[PDB]
RNA sequence: UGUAACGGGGCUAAACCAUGCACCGAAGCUGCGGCAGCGACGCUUAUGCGUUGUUGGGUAGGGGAGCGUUCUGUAAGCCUGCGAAGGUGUGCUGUGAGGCAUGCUGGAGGUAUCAGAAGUGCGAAUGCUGACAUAAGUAACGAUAAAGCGGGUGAAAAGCCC
RNA sequence: CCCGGCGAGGGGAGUGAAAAAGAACCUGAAACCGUGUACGUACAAGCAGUGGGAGCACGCUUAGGCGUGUGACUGCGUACC
């Protein structure tokens, strides 16, 4: 359960090739306030789909 | 004469044997005393 | 006096690490593996000077055999004809003629085919 | 080396290499294998070999025209500017002056001169005859270095 | 104008920040700010603060116009890791390394 | 228009004006040399194959330079037998400029 | 001066038709290997594919001497528990006839990427027709 | 475990026996170029010039000749703020250890030649000390008594306060 | 002075001969870890080199090619003590 000899930096980067983060495609623009937010998430301002829900 | 022109007679200095200073030096790695045994050891060798 | 040995050891290691340029992995960086790789390279280079002198001769022999069999004679009977006509052109120039100058190789084939018969 | 003679770990069982002292020369801060002592490097020269080298050195000091014999060499004040003007007048820059009787008037006004050292005739030494560019010697001091050597 | 901005001895590892810093290379700095806003990582918070500070330096210490800026070169490389003893079992010791990093953001208009 | 000839223990195949590097001769850096032993002279179509050193034809060549080649490094090693050895080698040449292939 | 070395762009490779109607398998395959490797061209180069594309028709009509029609067995392993599959000559001639000359030539070619390339040169067909008439291949009798 | 008793393809010769001539084939031998050791021989023996002949795989081991580092004398000399030691590239050069010049960094020392002395040359000793990798962003985050919500405060609250 | 959390850290300013001499402070190597550019690499098997060698990219030129970097393919080749 221990390595027989050390793995190279070559085999390190190949394994970390799948560890890359995926950025969001794009954010949405609300109809009234026009601020950016995630899809299907209420704004930091409390707007969601043209409707203020939370002060 | 000068102090930087003096020189000994040819054959005066022999410069000694430095045991253990590489492959190409002749002696080196066992320094001329063979492989294992009582003569190979530090302080070893039988008495007179 | 006490001799410190930073500069002479660093010089001896830069000497070996400079010859290991182009080697994969720790053979280009780590000194021990670089030293083994450099001595292995020197051994192979000696051996391959000898093997180069062999491999080019067998390449020329294959080219002369192909171009002579284009003319209708195998390499053994072609070399025997050129030897019995006392022609001292070696296999290097016969390969160079075989590739470049087909009519000169044709005349050499006709000379060997005259000399064998 | 200041330290204890205790084994730093066990003989077996531990993963590390064997060791039996922290004063071992392989170790750091604890050390030297073949440490040094104060030693007398002075080596014996035979009297005939010393005097043979002295006669060879004086003969080559003549034969290379670096020997100058002056009958009287003295300075009449202990001022060094008088000795400096005397060696400037004699075209002398780096000299060994050998006088058969050590007068203090000459010895004191040659102290601050770098290239000029004045020896008695008994204080003649061979590296001082080689090392100096010119040697001037009093006539009775020439007679003295004769009657000592040969 | 190159306009470097650094966060030296950043309390995070170089790999954990490098994972975030490989997302905003070459990006126009509005979309880079929006990406670092909507990335749910602590390295995104650190890298977003250095990017905002680099914008501020490029507006103040030299001329203007953040609407034409673009992130040329952002790189993270490790700093001085501090050594802490973590006691493991059966009496033995263990030295865990609290790793730091240096986050450098270079944003230009070019 | 080319000739085959034995210069320094090996055949060369040279054309007009070209410069060929071969072994060291006792020729100055600014002198002439005449290779009268020519093995094969080909001119257009007329190929004169030499039942040795054909007939009459003499190659004229001028020595350009006399330097030593690149250094090869001989490493002689024997694993676990406590033996290694290095030696450099730089092989002299003469560069001759072929001035004329005589027919 | 140095030697000659063929370049992988300026090599000209002709197309050839060979009929294997009633021939020995090994001697046919040997001349195929000779042409496919490039041992016949005067600008032969070992590290360059200088061979000529060969179309081999009537690949089920190739013959063998002796009892090798029934006695020559073709072993290959599936890489599995213990599956060693074997086929004689006539059953391979019935089922996949082109693979006979494929394996026979593939054993006489070099090993590595280059031998795989000069085996990609070979276009063997079991029938008398071929679809490569756009390449205008000459008849090669041997 | 898989053909698995030609190395393989394949071979009725591409097998065997006899004969014959070619060719391939080594670092062998020969051709050309260079270095060295030994022995004869004459030059007038700077005990080096040449001519020939022969030798030149090497462990343990014997013998011979050199390189480099630090320090002392030469040296209150010589190089050096129009740039030293060091570091890092490049190019020449020697049979080799090596040497020399030079671009960049550095910002004050270096040291010829010929001698002298060594804490004089590291890859290995489960070598010693410091640094940094590897497994790896993996295991784990320490009792399975248990948390949820509202307001606060703050740049930020699952954990703090109420 | 600006970003930052009346931070940490940084960018200008200013001192200085020099701030890649900024207090983690002369020089600042190697291992180790990055960013950018050139080449190679997703049908090809193994001490990772060595001999041959195309292409590509850079410099230059007696305009013939060299020099530098990588190096498909190919013969040979099972590390050191």
UniProtKB/Swiss-Prot annotation, chain D:
Highest taxon of source: Bacteria
GO BP, one annotated term: cytoplasmic translation
Family of this protein: Belongs to the universal ribosomal protein uL4 family.
Biological classification of the source: Bacteria, Pseudomonadati, Pseudomonadota, Gammaproteobacteria, Enterobacterales
Note: The erythromycin sensitive allele is dominant over the resistant allele.
Function recorded in the entry: One of the primary rRNA binding proteins, this protein initially binds near the 5'-end of the 23S rRNA. It is important during the early stages of 50S assembly. It makes multiple contacts with different domains of the 23S rRNA in the assembled 50S subunit and ribosome.
Protein's UniProt name: Large ribosomal subunit protein uL4
Span of the entire protein shown here: 52 to 201 of 201
Effect the entry attributes to changing residue 116 to D: Does not regulate the S10 operon in vivo
Gene Ontology CC: one annotated term: large ribosomal subunit
Keywords: Antibiotic resistance, Repressor, Ribonucleoprotein, Ribosomal protein, RNA-binding, rRNA-binding, Transcription, Transcription regulation, Transcription termination, Translation regulation
Organism of this sequence: Escherichia coli (strain K12)
Gene Ontology terms for molecular function: DNA binding; endoribonuclease inhibitor activity; mRNA 5'-UTR binding; RNA-binding transcription regulator activity; rRNA binding; structural constituent of ribosome; translation repressor activity
Disordered: region residues: 1-20
Subunit (UniProt): Part of the 50S ribosomal subunit. In TnaC-stalled ribosomes forms part of the binding pocket for L-Trp with the leader peptide and uL22.
Swiss-Prot record, chain E:
Keywords, comma-separated and alphabetical: Antibiotic resistance, Ribonucleoprotein, Ribosomal protein, RNA-binding, rRNA-binding
Record InterPro entries: Ribosomal_uL22 (IPR001063), Ribosomal_uL22_bac/chlpt-type (IPR005727), Ribosomal_uL22_bac/org-type (IPR047867), Ribosomal_uL22_CS (IPR018260), Ribosomal_uL22_sf (IPR036394)
The keyword RNA-binding appears for this protein: yes
BP term (GO), one: ribosome assembly
Residues the record lists as binding L-tryptophan: 90
Database matches in Gene3D superfamilies: Ribosomal protein L22/L17
Summary of the function given for this chain in its UniProt record: This protein binds specifically to 23S rRNA; its binding is stimulated by other ribosomal proteins, e.g. uL4, bL17, and bL20. It is important during the early stages of 50S assembly. It makes multiple contacts with different domains of the 23S rRNA in the assembled 50S subunit and ribosome. The globular domain of the protein is one of the proteins that surrounds the polypeptide exit tunnel on the outside of the subunit, while an extended beta-hairpin is found that penetrates into the center of the 70S ribosome where it lines the wall of the exit tunnel. Removal of most of this hairpin (residues 85-95) does not prevent its incorporation into 70S ribosomes. Two of the hairpin residues (Gly-91 and Ala-93) seem to be involved in translation elongation arrest of the SecM protein, as their replacement by larger amino acids alleviates the arrest.
Family stated for the protein in its record: Belongs to the universal ribosomal protein uL22 family.
UniProt-recorded name of the protein: Large ribosomal subunit protein uL22
UniProtKB/Swiss-Prot annotation, chain F:
PROSITE patterns, alphabetized: RIBOSOMAL_L21
GO cellular component: cytoplasm; cytosol; cytosolic large ribosomal subunit
InterPro entries (alphabetical): bL21-like (IPR028909), bL21-like_sf (IPR036164), Ribosomal_bL21 (IPR001787), Ribosomal_bL21_CS (IPR018258)
GO biological process terms held by the UniProt record: cytoplasmic translation
GO function terms (MF aspect): rRNA binding; structural constituent of ribosome
Keyword DNA-binding: no
Keywords in alphabetical order: Ribonucleoprotein, Ribosomal protein, RNA-binding, rRNA-binding
SUPFAM superfamilies: L21p-like (SSF141091)
Keyword RNA-binding: yes
Organism domain of life: Bacteria
Assembly, per entry: Part of the 50S ribosomal subunit. Contacts protein L20.
Family: Belongs to the bacterial ribosomal protein bL21 family.
Function: This protein binds to 23S rRNA in the presence of protein L20.
Name recorded for this polypeptide: Large ribosomal subunit protein bL21
Lineage, uppermost ranks: Bacteria, Pseudomonadati, Pseudomonadota, Gammaproteobacteria, Enterobacterales
Gene: rplU
UniProtKB/Swiss-Prot annotation, chain G:
Pfam families: Ribosomal_L13
GO BP term, example: negative regulation of translation
Gene Ontology MF: a single term: zinc ion binding
Its biological purpose: This protein is one of the early assembly proteins of the 50S ribosomal subunit, although it is not seen to bind rRNA by itself. It is important during the early stages of 50S assembly.
Similarity remark: Belongs to the universal ribosomal protein uL13 family.
Complexes and interactors: Part of the 50S ribosomal subunit.
NCBIfam families, sorted: rplM_bact (TIGR01066)
Protein name: Large ribosomal subunit protein uL13
């Amino acid at each position: 359960a221990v390595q027989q000899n050390k793995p190279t930096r070559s085999k390190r980067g190949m394994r970390r090739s799948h560890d890359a983060l995926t950025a969001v495609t794009s954010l949405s623009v609300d109809k009234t306030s026009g601020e950016k937010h995630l899809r299907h998430h209420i704004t930091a301002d409390g707007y969601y789909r043209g409707r203020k829900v939370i002060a | 004469m000068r102090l930087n022109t003096l020189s000994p007679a040819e054959g005066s200095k022999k410069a000694g044997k430095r045991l253990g200073r590489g492959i190409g030096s002749g002696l080196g790695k066992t320094g001329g005393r063979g492989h294992k045994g009582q003569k190979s050891r530090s302080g070893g060798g039988v008495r007179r | 006096a006490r001799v410190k040995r930073g500069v002479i050891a660093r010089a001896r290691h830069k000497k070996i690490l400079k010859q290991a340029k182009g080697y994969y992995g720790a053979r280009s960086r780590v000194y021990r593996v670089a030293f083994q790789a450099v001595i292995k390279a020197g051994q192979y280079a000696y051996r391959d000077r000898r093997q180069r002198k062999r491999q080019f001769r067998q390449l020329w022999i294959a080219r002369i055999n192909a171009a002579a069999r284009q003319n209708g004679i195998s390499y053994s009977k072609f070399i025997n004809g050129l030897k019995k006509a006392s022609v001292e052109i070696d296999r290097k120039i016969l390969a160079d003629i075989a590739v470049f100058d087909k009519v000169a190789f044709t005349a050499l084939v006709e000379k060997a085919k005259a000399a064998l018969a | 080396v200041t330290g204890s003679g205790k084994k730093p770990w066990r003989q077996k069982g531990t993963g590390r290499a064997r060791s039996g002292s922290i004063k071992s020369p392989i170790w750091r801060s604890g050390g030297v294998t073949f440490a040094a002592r104060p030693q007398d490097h002075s080596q014996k020269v035979n009297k005939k070999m010393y005097r043979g080298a002295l006669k060879s050195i004086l003969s080559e000091l003549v034969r290379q025209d670096r020997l100058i014999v002056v009958e009287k060499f003295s300075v009449e004040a202990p001022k060094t500017k008088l000795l400096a003007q005397k060696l400037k007048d004699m075209a002398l820059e780096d000299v060994l002056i050998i006088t058969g009787e050590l007068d203090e008037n000459l010895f004191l006004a040659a102290r601050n001169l770098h290239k000029v050292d004045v020896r008695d005739a008994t204080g003649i030494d061979p590296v001082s005859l080689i090392a100096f560019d010119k040697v001037v010697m009093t006539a009775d001091a020439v007679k003295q270095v004769e009657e000592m050597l040969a | 104008m190159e306009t470097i901005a650094k966060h030296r001895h950043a309390r995070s590892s170089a790999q954990k920040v490098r994972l975030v810093a490989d997302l905003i290379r070459g990006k126009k700095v509005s979309q880079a700010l929006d990406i670092l806003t909507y990335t749910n990582k602590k390295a995104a918070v650190l890298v977003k603060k250095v990017l905002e500070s680099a914008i501020a330096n490029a507006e103040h210490n030299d001329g203007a116009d953040i609407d034409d800026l673009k992130v040329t070169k952002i790189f993270v490389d490790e700093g001085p890791s501090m050594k802490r003893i973590m006691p493991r079992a059966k009496g033995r010791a263990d030295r865990i390394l609290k790793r730091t990093s240096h986050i450098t953001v270079v944003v230009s208009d070019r | 228009m080319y000739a085959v000839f034995q210069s320094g223990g090996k055949q060369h195949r040279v054309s007009e004006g070209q410069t060929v590097r071969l072994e060291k001769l006792d020729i100055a850096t600014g002198e002439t040399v005449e290779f009268a032993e020519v093995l094969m002279i080909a001119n257009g179509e007329e190929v004169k194959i030499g039942v040795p050193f054909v007939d009459g034809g003499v190659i004229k060549a001028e020595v350009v330079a006399h330097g030593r080649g690149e250094k090869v490094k001989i490493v002689k090693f024997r694993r676990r037998k406590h033996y290694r050895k290095q030696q450099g080698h730089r092989q002299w040449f003469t560069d001759v400029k072929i001035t004329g292939i005589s027919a | 001066m140095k030697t000659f070395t063929a370049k992988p762009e300026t090599v000209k490779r002709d197309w050839y038709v060979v009929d294997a109607t009633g021939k020995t398998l090994g001697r046919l395959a040997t001349e195929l290997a000779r042409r496919l490797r490039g041992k016949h061209k005067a600008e032969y180069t070992p590290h360059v594919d200088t061979g000529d594309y060969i179309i081999v028709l009537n690949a089920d009509k190739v013959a063998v001497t002796g009892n090798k029609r029934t006695d020559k067995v073709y072993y290959h392993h599936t890489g599995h528990i213990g599956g060693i599959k074997q086929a004689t000559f006539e059953e391979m001639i019935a089922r996949r006839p082109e693979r006979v000359i494929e394996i026979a030539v593939k054993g006489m070619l070099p090993k590595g990427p280059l031998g795989r390339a000069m085996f990609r040169k070979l276009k063997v067909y079991a029938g008398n027709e071929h679809n490569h008439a756009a390449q205008q291949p000459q008849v090669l009798d041997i």
